Amino acid sequence: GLPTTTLPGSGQFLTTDDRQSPSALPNYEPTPRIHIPGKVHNLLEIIQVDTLIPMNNTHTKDEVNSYLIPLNANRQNEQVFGTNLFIGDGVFKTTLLGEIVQYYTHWSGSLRFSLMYTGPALSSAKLILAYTPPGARGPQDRREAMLGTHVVWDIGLQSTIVMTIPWTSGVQFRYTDPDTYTSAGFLSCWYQTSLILPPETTGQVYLLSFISACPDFKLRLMKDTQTISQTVALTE
Amino acid sequence: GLPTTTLPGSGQFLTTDDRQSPSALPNYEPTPRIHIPGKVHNLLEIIQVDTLIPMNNTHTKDEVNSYLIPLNANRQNEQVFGTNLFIGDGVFKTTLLGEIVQYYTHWSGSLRFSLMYTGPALSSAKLILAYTPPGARGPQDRREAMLGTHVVWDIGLQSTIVMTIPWTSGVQFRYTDPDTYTSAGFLSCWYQTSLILPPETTGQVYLLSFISACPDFKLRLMKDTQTISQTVALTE
Amino acid sequence: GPALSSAKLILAYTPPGARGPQDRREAMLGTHVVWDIGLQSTIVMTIPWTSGVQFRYTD
Amino acid sequence: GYSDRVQQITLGNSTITTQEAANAVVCYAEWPEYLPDVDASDVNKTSKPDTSVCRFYTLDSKTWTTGSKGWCWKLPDALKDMGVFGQNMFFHSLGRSGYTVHVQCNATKFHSGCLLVVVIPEHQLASHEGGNVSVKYTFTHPGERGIDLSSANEVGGPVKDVLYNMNGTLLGNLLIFPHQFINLRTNNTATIVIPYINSVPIDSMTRHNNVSLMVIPIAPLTVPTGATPSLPITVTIAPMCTEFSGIRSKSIVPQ
Amino acid sequence: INYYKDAASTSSAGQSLSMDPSKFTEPVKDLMLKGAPALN
Amino acid sequence: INYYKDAASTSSAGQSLSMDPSKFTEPVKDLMLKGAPALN
Amino acid sequence: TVASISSGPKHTQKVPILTANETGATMPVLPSDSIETRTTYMHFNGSETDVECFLGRAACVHVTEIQNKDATGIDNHREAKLFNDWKISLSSLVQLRKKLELFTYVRFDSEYTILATASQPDSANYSSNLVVQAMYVPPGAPNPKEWDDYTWQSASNPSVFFKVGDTSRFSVPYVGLASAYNCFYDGYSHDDAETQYGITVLNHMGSMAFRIVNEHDEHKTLVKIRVYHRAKHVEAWIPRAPRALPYTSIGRTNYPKNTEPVIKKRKGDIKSY
Ligand SMILES: Cc1cc(CCCCCCCOc2ccc(C3=N[C@@H](C)CO3)cc2)on1
Q1: Which residues contact A67 (CB under 8 A, 6 or more apart)?
Q2: Residue with the nearest Cα to atom 14 of ligand 1?
Q3: G181 in ligand 1 pocket by Cβ < 6 Å?
Q4: Any contact of F with A, at least 3 CB pairs below 8 A?
Q5: Taking a C-beta distance cutoff of 8 angstroms, is the pair A164, G29 a contact?
Q6: Could you tell me the domains of chain B?
Q7: DSSP state of A216
Q8: Which CATH architecture does the domain made up of F1-40 adopt?
Q9: How open is the CA angle G152-G155-G161, to the nearest 5 degrees?
Q10: Where do transmembrane segments lie in this chain (chain D)?
C-alpha cells in the first residue's frame, strides 16, 4: 500500500478536462474509415471562404433583398452604404464569419470585404470604399471618408473588388461581442464618379457584398453563442 | 505521502471493466489441466458449422416436420419455399447461427445456405435457388427470381448443394434485430424443370436445409439475447 | 446574327435504328454538341461513322 | 489564346462548348474516381457501363422571370429516367456516381441578373408544417422536373422558402458549398464537377439522394427596355465514373 | 504491472487469436478437397 | 501512459496542425494566380 | 511566422485586388496587397479552433428522472418513473447540436459523464443513499419491463452502478454502422411511400436505461439524471451553413412556422453607422 494525500478539487467534474476512461465496450472493432472529400481540421480553415452579407438590412422580414445593395444612375458625390465593424453583431452577425466569431471571446486579424457588381455589361461606375480606423466618427461625406484606408474601384471586366480592413489596433485582441474600448472602425462606400447605364436600360443595379477573414486572423477563448437557445428538450 | 486528485467515475462499478483484485485464497494451487478434445476459442469458430433450419414453420406446435421442406412430383415452373433474410428472427432464429447472432448487435459477411436432397435414388429434379439483394420485393415467379443471385441445382449422386448469399450491401454492417434500412434481401427456390419419381414410388420427398456463416463473417457489440428470460431465481 | 445577340443551340446526330427525334429530349440522347454562339462564329459537328456494314450505297 | 472563358467538355458521345465560362469548380478539390478495393465492402464485381451512362443529359428547360424564387434538383433522381443511366439505376441494388453539372443562361450586354449555382451534399429538406412532420418520398423525388421554390406549399412536401435553403439555414451562407455564380454581365454558364460524397462506399440510388443542385436568382433579372421579361435557364448533367452493383429484379418505387 | 502475488488476481486474458474451426467443421477421417467430388 | 487497453479510452487527440483551406477557398479547375487577371 | 510582411508603394499592371467572384474562389488577398505594411509576427497557432478542441468538451445532452418509491400496486413501472429510459441521441438539446451540424459527417469516440442528484420535495426524516444502475440496452436486446426484471441482470450488456450525488464516467468507441455518423441524410430507409424522412432511421443507436437499485424507504426520493457527452478523437467532413432558425424536432431540419426575422433590421438607413 503506497501512501497518498488527496488535494482540493478531488471528485470534481470539469467539462473541459481531458483524461482516460474505461471503455464500456471492451474489444469492439469500429467500422473501417473510407475516404470522404471535404475534411475540416480547423474552424480557421472555413472562415476564409467568403459568404454574402445582408448589408441592406432595412427590410422588415428576412428577404433575398437585404443581400442587395442598390446603386442609382447619375448620382455624384453621394454615399452608397455605411456600417460599423462589430463583426459579432448587426450585418455581420448571420454570416459564416459572424457566426463562428460568436463561438469565441476574442478575435484579432485582417478582414477581407469584397463587392461583386451585377449591372449590365455596357454600364460603368467608379466607387470608393473607405475603412475608418477607431477614433473618428463614421465619415459623413467622401472628403472625410477618403482620408482613411480606401480603394477607388473601377467597374470593369473584372467583376469583384477585394478590400482588406488591415488590422489597425493598439490592443492586440478585440472582443467579438460589442466592446467600446475594443471597437474597430467603420466601413463606408461613395460614388467616386457615378454609375452610368447604357441606352435602353433602366432602374437600379445592385452590388453583392461578401466577408471572409484573412490568413492573419486569430480567434480565442471559446464560449457559448447567443445565436441559439431553447425552452424544452426536443423529442423525436 | 504523494499528492493525488480523484476524477469523476471514482468508486463506480462498470460490469465491463478489467482490473486486478486481491485473491481471497492466497497461495492455493489449482488442479492441473489434462487434455480434453474440443476446445473453443472464438464464437466465430462455431458459427461455421452448419445446422438445420426449421424452414417449414407452418406447423402449430414445434415438430420434426418443420425441418422438412416438401417437394411435389411433376409440378413445373412453381415455387418451393420463400423467406426473408432477417437472420435474427423467423426461421433463422433458433438455429445456432441465429442463436449466436443474437448475442451481438451488428453482423456483416457471407452466409452459406445448403439443401440436402432425400428422395429415392432413382428420382431426379432440377431446382433453382435465388438470392434477391435488398431493394426489390420477394420474387413472385422464377422469371423474377432468376434475374438475381441464383444456382441451378441438378439433383444427383452428390446430395447437397451449397448456395452462398454473398455480402451485398451499401453500409458495412447490418443489425441482427430486424432493421429496414439495414435489411438483407430474400431467398426463394422454384422448380427449374420438376421432380420426377421412379415407378412404384409415391408421394412427397423432402429437402433438409442448413445455415452456417462464411469465413467472411463479422459480429460485434455484444448484448443480451431476447431468447431467454425468467421471473424468479431458480433453486436446487 | 448581330454581334450583340447570343444563343445556345444543340445539334444531334441520331444513328440508324431510331426515328428522327421528335423533341430535344429524344434528340439529346444521341451524338450531340451544345453550341454556344460567340466570338468564334462557326461550330463543326462531326457525324462519326456509326455502322454495322462497312459501306453504305450513295443512292 | 486559351481563356478561362472558352471550354469544351466531351464525355461519351456528347460535347458541350462554352465561349463565356468563369473557370469551373471541382467540389472539395477532388475529381470523381472509381471505388478502390481498400474501401470496398460488398463482394460483388461492379458493372461500369462507361460511355453509355457517362454522357450529358439535358433536363427540360426552366424560365427565369422577375418573379422566380429558384429551383432545386436532387441527384441521382433528376436522371432516374435518362437513357441507360436510369435503367441501370432501377435494376441494381447499389450504384455510385460523380457528375459534371453545366448550367446555361445567356442574355445580352443590356441585361442584368445573377444566379447562384450550388451543390449541397446531403440536403435534408424541412417540412413546412414544423414540428416533426416528415417530407414524403414523392416530394423529395421530383425527377427531371425538380422542385420549384415559387410553387405553393403542398401536403407532405418540403417548405420552399428561399432565405432559408429549405432547411433552417440562411441563403447568404450557401457559399460555404461548392458553387459558382452566373452574372449576365460576366458569365453565361456555371460548371461544377462532383466527386461521390457519402459515409458508405456505395449506396442505394433510389432511397437516398446525395446532392441537391440548386439554381437561385439573387440579383433579379432586369431586361432592357421593351425586351421580353424572361430568359430560359437549361441544366445539362453527365454521370461520370458510374458503377452499379447487385443486379436483380428491378426496383418498384412509390408513385 | 501486477500488484498482487497470485495469478488469479490478474486481469482478463488477451485474445486467443487461435481460431481453427476444422475440429468442428471438418472432423472427417479421409480429407475432403473442395471441388473434388464428395463421394468417389 | 495509457492505463487502459482500448483506444477509445485514451484522452483527446492533439492538434491536427493540418490546415489547408484551399479545398474550400479555391476549388477551381484551372488555377488562378493572384495578380493575374481573373478572366482572360 | 510572419502575420504581415513589409510592403511599400506599388504602381503596377499586376492588380491582385480585382477578381471575378463568379468563379467560386475566395482569392487569398492580404493587407499588404492594398496598403503599405510593416512586418509583424503571428505569435499564435490556432490551437483552440482545432475541431478536436471545438467538439471536445463535455456538453449536457440529456436530463431524465426516476424515483425510488414503493412499487406495490404499480401497474406500469415505466410509467411511474420507477425506471426511466432514454433513446440515446445527441440532438435533443441544442447547444451541442448546432456545433455538430456545422459538419455533414462526424466520427468520434464518446466519453459520457452521468451526474445524479436527489431531491426530497416532501417531508423526509433523512436523505437515503441510493445507488443508480444505468444499462446499455442496444436494439435487439430485451428491454426492461419492471424496475427489477431479469433484464437488469445485464449479463452481456455493459452496465455501471454509481451512487446518487456522485458521477459515473466511461467511454464508448464510435459505434456507428457506416464510416461516419450522418449529421444529415436526404434519404429514407426504403422506397416506401409513407416511410419517415431524415436520419431518425439511420442513428439507430438504441436506448439507455436507468433505475435505482435500492428498495423503498418510508419517504419518496426523486433522482434526476444528467448525461454529459464529450467527443474524443474527432474527424469531421464537409462544412455547411450554420443553423439560423430554431429547432422543432430530433432529427429533422424543420423550423417553426411564423418564426421571427433572424437578420436584425437596421435602426436607420443602409447608410447608417
Ligand atoms: C453503462 C453504459 C451505458 C452505455 C452507453 C453506450 C454508448 C452508446 C451511444 C453511442 C453514441 O451515440 C450517438 C448517437 C447519435 C450521434 C450523432 N447524431 C448526430 C447529430 C451526430 O452524432 C452520435 C452518437 O455504455 N455503457
Answers
A1: A52, A53, A54, A55, A56, A208, D171, D172, D218
A2: G89
A3: yes
A4: yes
A5: yes
A6: 1-236 (2.60.120.20)
A7: T
A8: Irregular (4.10)
A9: 55
A10: none
Among B13, B174, B224, whose Cβ lies nearest the Cβ of G155?
B224
Bridge partners of A69, per DSSP, are: A207
Angle ∠(G63,G66,G72) on CA atoms, nearest 5: 165
| Shortest CA gap A73–chain D (Å) | 14
Contact residues, chain C, for D57 at CB < 8 Å: 28-29
Domain ranges across chain G: 1-273
Which CATH architecture describes the domain G1-273?
Sandwich (2.60)
> Distances from the Cα of E33 to the Cαs of B27, B117, C20, F15, G152, in angstroms?
51, 21, 61, 54, 49
**Does G141 reach chain A within 8 Å, measured CB to CB?**
no
Atom of ligand 1 nearest to the CA of G138: 8
Q: Which residue has the cell 451512362?
A: D53
Cα distances from G129 to residues A98, D195, G117, G210, in angstroms, run 49, 58, 11, 16
Resolution of the experimentally solved model in angstroms: 2.9
> Hey, where are the domains in chain D?
1-255
Cell numbers describing residue A28:
469492439
Element at B43 (helix H, strand E): helix B43-46
Let me know if domain D1-255 sits in CATH 3.10.28.10. no
Task: Specify the DSSP class assigned to residue B105.
Answer: E
Residue B144 corresponds to which cell in the numbers above?
Answer: 423474377
Identify whether the C-beta of residue D116 lies closer than 8 Å to the C-beta of residue D178.
Answer: no
Give the separation between CA D234 and CA D73, rounded to whole angstroms. Answer: 12
Q: Whose CA is nearest to atom 16 of ligand 1?
A: G90
Report domain extents, chain F.
Answer: 1-40
Q: What letter represents residue E20's amino acid?
A: D
Is G66 touching ligand 1 by the criterion CB < 6 Å?
no
Cβ of G182 closer than 6 Å to ligand 1, yes or no, is no
Map chain G to HEC letters. Answer: CEEECCECCCCCCCCCCEECHHHCCCCCCCHHHCCCECCEECCCCCHHHEHHHHHCCCEEEEEEEEEECCCCCCCCCCCCCCCCEECCCCCCCHHHHHHHCCEEEEEEEEEEEEEEEEECCCCCCCCCCCEEEEEEECCCCCCCCCCCCHHHHCCCCCEEEEEECEEEEEEECCCCCCCCEECCCCECCCCCCCCCCCCCCCCCCCEEEEEECCCCCCCCEEEEEEEEEEEEEEEEEEECCCECCCCCCCCCCCCCCCCCCCCCCCCCCCCCC
- Given a contact cutoff of 8 angstroms between Cβ atoms, the answer to whether D183 and G22 are in contact is yes
Q: Which three cell numbers stand for residue D203?
A: 449506396
Antiparallel, parallel or unpaired: β G159-163 and D57-58: unpaired
Distance CA D94, CA D42 (A): 9
| Contact predicate A115/A153, CB 8 Å | yes
**DSSP H or E segment with residue A96:** helix A96-101
Count how many Cα atoms sit within 13 Å of the Cα of residue C3 in the half-sphere of its side chain. Answer: 2
